[PDB]
């Protein structure tokens, strides 16, 4: 049951982060849905755990309207948050409002990956 308690605490962590990502995304007018799901990483298979152990850890379903859906790892959301927070504070502190500043914020998208 230690894998249960570990999974449980991870799902709590992910539950919160997904909420913070969603909010910043909304503020920056880059609306994006973050949903928590499971995945079974290759590590869980190569770690020959005791039978009865859960293989799952949280992963993040990332959805953007008229674009598609993708999975991020929790670690990846956690890292991207470093960038989203940065971009947000940069936005909140910008006193510029020029063609270049506008475009800079419009184009900056750490929230979803075009993948093409």
């Amino acid at each position: 049951n230690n894998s249960l308690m570990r999974l449980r605490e991870q799902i709590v962590k992910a539950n919160l982060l997904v909420r913070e990502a969603s909010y910043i995304a909304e503020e920056l007018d880059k609306r994006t849905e973050y949903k928590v799901t499971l995945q079974i990483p290759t590590s869980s298979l190569d770690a020959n755990r005791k039978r009865g152990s859960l293989l799952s850890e949280p992963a993040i379903q990332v959805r953007r309207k008229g674009k598609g859906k993708q999975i991020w790892s929790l670690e990846k959301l956690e890292n991207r948050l470093l960038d989203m927070r940065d971009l947000y504070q940069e936005w909140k502190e910008c006193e510029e409002d020029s063609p270049v500043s506008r475009s800079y914020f419009k184009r900056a998208d750490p929230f979803y990956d075009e993948q093409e």
Binding site: V100, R102, K106, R107
Partner: protein
Amino acid sequence: YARPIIILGPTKDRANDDLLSEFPDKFGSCVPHTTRPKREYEIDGRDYHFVSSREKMEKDIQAHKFIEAGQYNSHLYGTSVQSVREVAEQGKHCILDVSANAVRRLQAAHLHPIAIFIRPRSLENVLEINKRITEEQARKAFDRATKLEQEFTECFSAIVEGDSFEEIYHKVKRVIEDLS
């Protein structure tokens, strides 16, 4: 070949956004150049054309290789004729967020832009079409729009007016389709 777009006047930015997000197959934004390093969530040739040499770029700016160039937070950003040109070939109207001077520059480059000035009838008119802006802020827009029309009248393909942004957006839509 689709004609590039520049909207000007009050509410231009919301009009710009709505066109891009509401009709994404017909409208596009071009890829600007920047001297800023690429970040992990960006992609060369999609987010920006990332340039390795600020000096080469400053030189290209001085030689009018961009229709608009600026600095923001230590880095140079430029919009090039070829980027604009490249969106147009793909049958999309390049939605351009650029100064009114970029219009003569686009004209000369043979891009045949569609420049549209959203013209407010009064100070309260701004309050009608820009219900978001404040009384202090709505005033200074009329002043910018009057001086804008005084200088660049001859650069406009069309001028739109309304009592609501709904009326104006509707009209911007029609001017574009009419002139192409």
